[PDB]
Symmetry: C2
Subunit: 181 residues, 2 copies
């Protein structure tokens, strides 16, 4: 946001923030409109810009205030756990953060409706942080999660698929094939 | 499209199709505006709707005529090759069809700017066990980076080599050497 959002009442500022948060719970970035946020607050459109550069600013701020990087979970897990242990724990961490939490809808949009522009501009702060390992992991997990949201999966069909595919990655395609013959 | 588009004389129909095509070579489906295509044909806006149900109709039509499903290429390799043979040739096939191609920009948009609405409604002219899922994820990501980071053929080939090798050897094997 701008300095002009930050020096607001710890009461007044929450009115506008929460106002945004609702739109973003109801719309993907593309579906979301400055109009809705602004009419919700009952304040002229131009006043929106006293706080944000554009809708994207508020989007990324809300996102940064309500959501974490899925893979940060796994990296932190890696401290006290080996790779495999971390992998088997990660699935549950994913379910806890993605499904049962107030940020469900946020994430649903974060994963089903995410374009190049968003991808390109989104950056988060990092106390523990392009190598092939994390590329493969991220792809397979993000795909699984994509299917969790796009197919309204139950925790058990998620854990089932997750188990299969992650097992494949860790044991490797060659193993997985000669195991089943 | 609509019947009204197919019963169009060759010259005409080709004019329309090319206007569309040209729009989609320049714009993501979200950027593509039905108005641009219509202005470039010098026809009013509601004429588009003689030929298409919406922009999406035209989009999908152009994709079905100009592009392929990259994973179809791979399966096709499998029918006559072993799994790792297939994997190794795949990268080259991928390059051939995605890059040295007139449809390059089309693909670029297909990978950089897809939406759930798009993915849901998209039905091409061709199962999902874990193999094809994992392979598909890893590869689409590789290709995403190929397009978004303007990778050389060699850069793609390098990253692909590494990551597919991880997948076939498997994580644990890969990291212990």
């Amino acid at each position: 946001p701008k300095s002009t959002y930050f020096s607001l009442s710890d009461e007044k500022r929450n009115r506008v923030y929460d106002a945004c948060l609702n739109e973003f719970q109801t719309h993907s970035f593309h579906e979301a409109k400055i109009m809705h946020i602004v009419k919700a607050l009952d304040i002229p459109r131009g006043s929106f810009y006293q706080y944000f550069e554009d809708l994207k600013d508020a989007y990324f701020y809300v996102l940064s205030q309500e959501t974490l990087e899925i893979h940060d979970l796994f990296f932190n897990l890696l401290k006290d756990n080996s790779i495999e242990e971390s992998l088997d724990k990660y699935k549950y961490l994913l379910l806890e953060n993605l499904i049962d939490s107030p940020q469900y809808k946020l994430y649903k949009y974060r994963f089903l409706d995410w374009t190049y522009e968003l991808e390109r501009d989104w950056k988060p702060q990092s106390s523990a942080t392009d190598n092939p390992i994390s590329q493969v992991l991220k792809s397979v997990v993000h795909n699984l999660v994509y299917r969790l949201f796009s197919e309204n999966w139950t925790e058990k069909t998620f854990i089932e698929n997750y188990d299969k595919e992650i097992k494949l990655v860790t044991e490797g395609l060659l193993n997985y094939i000669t195991d089943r013959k």
